Amino acid sequence: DLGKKLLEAARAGQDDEVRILLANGADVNTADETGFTPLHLAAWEGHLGIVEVLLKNGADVNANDERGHTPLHLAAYTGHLEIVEVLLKNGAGVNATDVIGTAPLHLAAMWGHLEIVEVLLKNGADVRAQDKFGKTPKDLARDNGNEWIRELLEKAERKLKDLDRKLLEAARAGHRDEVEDLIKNGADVNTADETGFTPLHLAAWEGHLGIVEVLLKNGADVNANDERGHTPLHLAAYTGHLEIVEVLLKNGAGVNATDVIGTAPLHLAAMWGHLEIVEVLLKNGADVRAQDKFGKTPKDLARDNGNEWIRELLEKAERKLKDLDRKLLEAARAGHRDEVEDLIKNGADVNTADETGFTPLHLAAWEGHLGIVEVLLKNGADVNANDERGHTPLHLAAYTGHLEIVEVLLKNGAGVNATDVIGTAPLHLAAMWGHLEIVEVLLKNGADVNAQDKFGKTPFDLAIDNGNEDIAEVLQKAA
């Protein structure tokens, strides 16, 4: 229509004819099927006059297209110095990025448009911005033999590394104004010192709520680990900065992060007596059963350090979880799949055991509830768990005669030659109880045919003794 005539006359260089369409009401910000606009094509083709005109007639300088390319991208790709200056003066997004993360500075650094690089930096371009492949403009200029550009961008970078050192000091001291100026002048909020402390670690350790929130506003990694696995939430919870604990959680902080010693935020809060932080972490899902390398839970540290209020609080949080484990054992025996998943979501231990050592996986394999077996293996249930007499779930599957469950357990590393205290292996129970299909599977998986219970009976002997000829034959041909 009236607009399609414009986008075409914009790439043709018909300066005088552009005035005709605009006077007759042709919209200035029309778009095609790929997203291009009269300003894109005038900047791509290098028609400065047509650009300037469209800017007096109000053209969206930062207009994006189907993949987020502004007119400045196109002027940077082609290398039109003048059009770059005219687009920036009208408020062009000097740091605009496409869907790949490519900014105008990347393009000028890759195609060797030195003058445009100077221009873009003059207007506050981000020299450190990485694209999809984690490559800065300097990286591109290096990989394309543009050494004069590589030199300039490298000078820029080392200055910005001084700002990074200052930002770390400003965040520890509490100079909120210094921090904000540093960020405004390109300092990296995710920089780290020698031991991996980022500015968020230091603001969190020292208790600077304002500086914590500013760092988070500018993309700081809330979960950054230092060289020993300590996150900002560890330091907040150690020093007892309740409000920083709250802000860190609200921004994605991991409530159960563990350092190299297995210490979690709830350990420090519990050992050092920060009741409100204990409540906040529990409210946010902290694991009360987590142990450090000394087998100590937060509860143990609490009583060990004479913090009785927190001690009782964690006892009740733990007693509540014992009842879910109890429910998981009965849910796993009865075959109620949906009930199993809910109890796991709410914190049921898939490796709890009753008085005689049966685990939810034992009961599920005994009763032939395959669906629950898969759920329990997919959530970390020990596949080679012994009860108080040495029976694994693979014992209970061969005895009962569940072919499917046997193949699953073996598919997940289940011990095939496990023996109870008597010497009975899964192959004895399969041959004993006439489950030929399970015998087959066991043989393929290295089942020992020479194993003997305390009575000196091989699986072959038990097939013979119990009148299972087909099985005795199979066990005969193997040896």
Author numbering: 13 to 491
Sentences from the paper on this structure:
In this paper, we present a strategy to fuse specific, high-affinity protein binders to obtain multivalent or multispecific scaffolds of predetermined geometry. DARPins are used as building blocks to confer the desired specificity to the construct. A series of rigid connector modules replacing the DARPin capping repeats allow to combine the individual DARPin domains in such a way that their distance and angle can be altered to test different geometries, bringing the binding partners of the DARPins into a defined spatial arrangement.
D12_H15_D12_H15_D12, the construct with the longest shared helices, crystallized in space group P21 and the structure was refined at 2.4 Å resolution. Indeed, in the majority of the D12-containing structures analyzed in this study, the D12 paratope-paratope interaction provided the largest crystal contact, with a total of around 1700 Å2 of solvent-accessible surface buried in the interface. Similarly, in D12_H15_D12_H15_D12, the N-terminal DARPin interacts with the C-terminal DARPin of one symmetry-related molecule, the middle DARPin with the C-terminal DARPin of a second one, and the C-terminal DARPin with the middle DARPin of a third symmetry-related molecule. The rmsd for the comparison between design and crystal structure of DDD constructs with H06, H12 and H15 ranges from 1.5 to 4.2 Å. Considering the elongated shape of the DDD molecules, which amplifies the effect of small deviations in the connector, they agree remarkably well with the designs. The structures of these DDD fusions are very extended in one direction (>110 Å from N- to C-terminus), and thus amplify the effects of small deviations in the inter-domain angles, making the agreement with the designs even more remarkable.
